Amino acid sequence: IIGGEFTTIENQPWFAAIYRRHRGGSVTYVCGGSLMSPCWVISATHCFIDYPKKEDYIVYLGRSRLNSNTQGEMKFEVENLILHKDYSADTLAHHNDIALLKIRSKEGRCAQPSRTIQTICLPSMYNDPQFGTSCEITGFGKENSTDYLYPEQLKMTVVKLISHRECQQPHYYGSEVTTKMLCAADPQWKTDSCQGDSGGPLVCSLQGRMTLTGIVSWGRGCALKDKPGVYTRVSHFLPWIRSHT
């Protein structure tokens, strides 16, 4: 995240941190996830499109720091990895960038809810907040583009959603942003999402309830003028999310 505030998992009980083991031993961090139900998690496919092996990942439902066992955590494995069957990635625009990582502990169990481990809500057919609506995003991503190290503590920020036609202007994304994408950003461009926060939760507060509206996907740079962050329009994929769970 760029700027923003340092939070803790207790404030984002549905945030899952996805790791990957290497042939050798080392374990580095990959992307962010959202817990939909005990046995499931939803992210983005570009995080896994290069190593489609389920045995390669590790997910955390309760970790505050990147190299620490923040009280109350639980370690998981990926029982099933379902990628959207038509993913493609252009120069910037990432098509059908949504995925499913069915978790399971070594004993064979799913997520066990607590003050720290909870889940967010699925949207409904044709119902996304109207532009201008502020929402939040959580992630261990970069703080400044000019870095090579992810922040040792989880961060969070607020951004405003932008209309479709506004994000489709020439000095923005043009026609590289379809209807199945959302755009959001600080109107002063000081805070934003960046590499590492990919695949994380874009939570808007729709109708009193917190909802997983977007999914960190792509974006030109990080916090650049007239260059919002793009997100997958979660709602649209209801008949998909549904038919595979």
Ligand X SMILES: CC(C)C1=NCCc2ccc(NC(=O)c3ccc4cc(C(=N)N)ccc4c3)cc21
Q: Which residues are catalytic?
A: 46, 97, 198
**Among residue numbers 216 through 235, which ones bind ligand X (CB under 6 A)?**
216, 218-219, 222, 229
| Residue 90 touches ligand X, criterion: CB under 6 A | no
229 near 192, Cβ under 8 Å?
Answer: yes
Q: CA 183 from chain center: how many Å?
A: 14
198 in contact with ligand X (CB under 6 A): yes
Instruction: Kindly state the smallest distance separating residue 207's Cβ from ligand X, in Å.
Output: 26
Residue, CB closest to ligand X: 219
50 near ligand X (CB under 6 A): yes
In angstroms, the CA 61 to CA 73 distance is 6
Instruction: Please work out, in degrees rounded to the nearest 5, the angle formed at the alpha carbon of residue 195 by the alpha carbons of 193 and 198.
Output: 70
Q: Is 214 helix (H, G, I), strand (E, B) or coil?
A: strand
Instruction: Please state the three-class secondary structure of 34-79 as a single string.
Output: EEEECCEEEECHHHCCCCCCHHHEEEECCCCECCCCCCCCCEEEEE
Q: Which of 120, 212, 202 is nearest to 159 (CA)?
A: 202
> For residues 28 and 69, which CB has a smaller minimum distance to ligand X in the complex?
28
# of chain residues touching ligand X (CB under 6 A)? 13
Does 193 engage in binding with ligand X (CB under 6 A)? yes
- Piece of the chain touching ligand X by CB under 6 A; list 67-75, 118-126, 168-176, 188-196: 188-196
- 96 makes contact with ligand X (CB under 6 A): no
Chain residues in the site for ligand X (CB under 6 A): 46, 49-50, 192-195, 198, 216, 218-219, 222, 229
